[PDB]
Amino acid sequence: GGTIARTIVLQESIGKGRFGEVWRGKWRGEEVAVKIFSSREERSWFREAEIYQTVMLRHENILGFIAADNKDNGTWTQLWLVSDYHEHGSLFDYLNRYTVTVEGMIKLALSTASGLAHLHMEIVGTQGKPAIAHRDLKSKNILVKKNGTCCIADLGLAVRHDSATDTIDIAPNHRVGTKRYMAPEVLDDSINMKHFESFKRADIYAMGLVFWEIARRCSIGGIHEDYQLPYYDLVPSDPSVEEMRKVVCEQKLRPNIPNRWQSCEALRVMAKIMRECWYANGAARLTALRIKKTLSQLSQQ
Ligand SMILES: O=C(Nc1cc(Nc2c(Cl)cnc3c2OCO3)ccn1)C1CC1
User: Fold this and answer.
1) How far apart are CA 241 and CA 85, in angstroms?
2) Where is the active site?
């Protein structure tokens, strides 16, 4: 019989995401992470399996996919996605728990940017990889590895591009992701969803917000900010699209960039990146590749 889900033993509930539930399990004694969906969540499970099985997707900054599988407990069927397990868990949890050095902040930012640039990059060839946009990037969907680098997870809302015929592989709906991190053009439904570049540009805005979350926790001489989500100072917990739109589109506010960040070159570079991710017009935003190059150069300095 089956060689994956059949031989994995669940040990601990991690939490619920948008769809399904995440567990820590053991496969041949090795820790793995398992996202479990019910029968009525088959479409979400299949789509996420489909994205993870994209040719040439594997990358140190994308969550390591092990397998999609079914498991029948004798009463109902569970739909499984099995991945690498990372003890730290999400970047959200990590940044709540800890402060980071300049070096640590750069490692988190660069690795996140490298993951995104890999998603975004079309790789030509017989085993070519289509460009992929995530559509729900946030600190809760990025995991921190033991080596202090990040990998991106939760690929179920992603869209894939066919460059040749110029088509996206699904018919995407407006506003599928996390409201707090929606780009201005997503918030007001102005985004042109026939244009794949628009989804890439929306991801960059969200990454900018994640970079802000990280930079806050960069402690220099004991001085740092408390952990906050972007827009903590302007919208309620669990904000509505209208609440978000009023702040982001009408008032045109972005997360505050503290004065203390100009006094350190690494923070200065990060703050400049954030601004250039946060333009209301997506076409003006930096690319993931450019951001990766800037952070790579910085980590060398
Ligand atoms: O939570 C922890 N680790 C952890 C959590 C993961 N979450 C996810 C996410 Cl976010 C999305 N898709 C998944 C996941 O697992 C399978 O598919 C993955 C790996 N490791 C440690 C704090 C206990």
Assistant:
1) 33
2) 136 (proton acceptor)
